[PDB]
């Protein structure tokens, strides 16, 4: 008896929230933006090529200083780059080649990276010794780390192949809240600008939002087909974008509790691997299986430009925190910085 | 360019020098997946060849370094982490021949052999491994040669010759797996019947790797 009653109550509540979402859906962002001036062609050009990695780049992240960027590769090397002058500021030998993810702290003191060893290794850049070394290995994940984001120098949130995210105290080296509500394994994180909320995407094509202290999912967004590879918050924090193997990108608004826009064009047949907004929020930048980045007017959903410069799968994007540039990483082993 | 920026460019060239000297090492290693249908004799070949998350093992044999990635600890969705291994020289794959009349513990409906065929087809015909050869160990040789006297191979397959002698049964397992390869021109399956002497199992990896690398070189040269 009871399991079928609870399954009918799950069906009833799923039906109630889709009706509640469709009730507050009084317009579309395409209608609301009918009057605005379009972006026009975003002809960005490669101002640097960072050309020291010897295998596929899997992740990169900017410092808050918006001049340094970390990147990681299958070479088992993570590099911090001076993006202004192409210098390798540091290169870090990882304990493992298999770097699915990296992140760089809001103060630039620390770097994190994950992998197919489920450990998040955290590296102290600003030691009194001149070599970068590990602070913690955050071992308690059951599947590969897909994403990392520092809230601050002593708290990181991670997401994994085990269908969980976790928030760690980096001092004691242990989970503090742990987040389990997905059913597919989890592929991407983004923090809200206030870093109290975050949102993560999984292979069930649900994106779920959390509060890091409440320890529990507030909202579930599920407009995607297939599987979500990529997430970014829109810079106001009230919305986020998602990139899938369903070749569309999608913009979800938290207060609307649902999908606003769907960025697809009929000749992008292939997965989005990474996403970022530009500083105003006006451009989505999205990285693809088909070897380039597309650039989208995030309000109109027209394709505003292309970052064509890669000879293998773009696996990363990041717009600098000052908005000045976009780095792109790819499986061709070069980063290219565009403005 | 300032006195500090000249020293920072130097540092960057020092990083590059050593970062490239590490590539000169990492390109000389041979990179191998190791795959198998759960507990499948995989751990036995790992200890023979040496004597959380993925386990990576190192060996050198006849003056050639191998890196072998036992990925079997990643229980989750291969579609989102197997693309790491696109640069692998050869997959090593394991099947315990004893699995023909054992059944899969999560439902007890499907034979462990059919579960390992689902995995072999799944890795073999996948887009990242299209040029990547598979070494295929067939692991628990002795226990299969004993058990087939007690339990005929038709308990696995609706279709078989019904011969049930060890040699034609074992060669029918090999035939049933090599028939899963949808691209026999781009990749060759190197099947081996695993044996008690460590160096015989290692020599087969060295042979199949050397032959894969020669067939890759001949495909570069235009001799193929």
């Amino acid at each position, epitope marked *: 008896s009871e399991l079928d009653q609870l399954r009918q109550e799950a069906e009833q509540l799923k039906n109630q929230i889709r009706d509640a979402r469709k009730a507050c859906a009084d317009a579309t962002l395409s209608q609301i933006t009918n009057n605005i001036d379009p972006v026009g062609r975003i002809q960005m050009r490669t101002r640097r090529t960072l050309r020291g990695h010897l295998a596929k780049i899997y992740a990169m992240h900017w410092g808050t200083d918006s001049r*340094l960027l970390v990147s990681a590769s299958q070479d088992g090397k993570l590099i911090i780059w001076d993006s202004y002058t192409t210098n390798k500021v540091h290169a870090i030998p990882l304990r493992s080649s298999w770097v699915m993810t990296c992140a760089y702290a809001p103060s630039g003191n620390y770097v994190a990276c994950g992998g197919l060893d489920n450990i998040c290794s955290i590296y102290n850049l600003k030691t*009194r*010794e001149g070599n970068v070394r590990v602070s913690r290995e955050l071992a308690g994940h059951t599947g590969y780390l897909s994403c990392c984001r520092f809230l601050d120098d002593n708290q990181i949130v991670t997401s994994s192949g085990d269908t969980t995210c976790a928030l760690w105290d980096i001092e004691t080296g242990q989970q503090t809240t742990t987040f389990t509500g997905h059913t597919g394994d989890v592929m991407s994180l983004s923090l809200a600008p206030d870093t109290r909320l975050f949102v993560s995407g999984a292979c069930d094509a649900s994106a779920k939002l959390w509060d890091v202290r409440e320890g529990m999912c507030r909202q579930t967004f599920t407009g995607h087909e297939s599987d979500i590879n990529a997430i970014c918050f829109f810079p106001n924090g009230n919305a986020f974008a998602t990139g899938s193997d369903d070749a569309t990108c999608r913009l979800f608004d938290l207060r609307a509790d649902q999908e606003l826009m769907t960025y697809s064009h009929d000749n992008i047949i292939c997965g989005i691997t990474s996403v970022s907004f530009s500083k105003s929020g006006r451009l989505l930048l999205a990285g693809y299986d088909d070897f380039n980045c597309n650039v989208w007017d995030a309000l109109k959903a027209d394709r505003a430009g292309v970052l064509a410069g890669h000879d293998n799968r773009v696996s990363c994007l990041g717009v600098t925190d000052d908005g000045m540039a976009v780095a792109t990483g790819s499986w061709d082993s070069f980063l290219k910085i565009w403005n | 360019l*300032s*006195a500090e920026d000249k*020293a*920072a460019v*130097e540092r960057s060239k020092m990083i590059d020098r050593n970062l490239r000297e590490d590539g000169e090492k990492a390109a000389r290693e041979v990179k191998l997946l190791l795959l198998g249908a759960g507990e499948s004799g995989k751990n036995t070949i790992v200890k023979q060849m040496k004597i959380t998350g993925i386990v990576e093992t190192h060996f050198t044999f006849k003056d050639l370094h191998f890196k072998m990635f036992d990925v079997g600890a990643q229980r989750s969705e291969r579609k989102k982490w197997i693309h790491c291994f696109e640069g692998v020289t050869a997959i090593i794959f394991c099947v315990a021949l004893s699995d023909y009349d054992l059944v899969l513990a999560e439902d007890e409906e499907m034979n462990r052999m059919h579960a390992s065929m689902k995995l072999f087809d799944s890795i073999c015909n996948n887009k990242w491994f299209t040029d990547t050869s598979i070494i295929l160990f067939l692991n628990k040789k002795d226990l299969f040669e004993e058990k087939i006297k007690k339990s005929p191979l038709t308990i696995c397959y609706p279709e078989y010759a019904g011969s049930n002698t060890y040699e034609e049964a074992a060669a029918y397992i090999q035939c049933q797996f090599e028939d899963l390869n949808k691209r026999k021109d781009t990749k060759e399956i190197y099947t081996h019947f695993t044996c008690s002497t460590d160096t015989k199992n290692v020599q087969f990896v060295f042979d199949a790797v050397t032959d894969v690398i020669i067939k890759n070189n001949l495909k570069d040269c235009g001799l193929f």
Partner: single-chain antibody
Amino acid sequence: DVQLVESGGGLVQPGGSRKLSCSASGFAFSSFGMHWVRQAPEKGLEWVAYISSGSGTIYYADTVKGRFTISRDDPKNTLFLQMTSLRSEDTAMYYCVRSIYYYGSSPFDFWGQGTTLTVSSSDIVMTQATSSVPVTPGESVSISCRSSKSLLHSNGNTYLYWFLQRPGQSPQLLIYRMSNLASGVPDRFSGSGSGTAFTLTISRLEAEDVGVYYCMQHLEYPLTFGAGTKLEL
């Protein structure tokens, strides 16, 4: 702790020879550029020589160019300075000094305790507003320094370093460019400037702020210190 210890030298005859040695320990020495700096008895600092991290990019001051050779052995974490035709003008305490160069780094951040050497018997001039000032704890002080060239470089960062040498100590970095404090330095100190003239302010002195303060420039080799202002209790 990070350490720089200097088996060094002692007495020599003038026109003689000596090998200064500086064994580093407790840090990744192979990655640091190493300087030597010196200090004649009751005088200001002179930069002497440099090696970068890769053992390339050696430099010297014109007072020692060709007479001294600077050398390193990274497998022993050791730096050397081999001294030939030692003049009476080479009588000084010599400090081995580490430096590391990358964006946001603090070079000159740790100094060896120093070796005496003693003898029997074209660049930016840096200068400071006085020989000394009188002080007491809880006051505020604004030390000042002047450069014979603009130290504000086209890349935007300004190569004024500030050091404190406490009585009988080896020097310590306070501030690495005009305004960036070192690690291990308290929030009392704060530097600023126009690009040719500069200040180090100490916001609320403590008795540990007694000592001699040197500005230095790092825009060009040869590196040049001011003759340091004493703060006197």
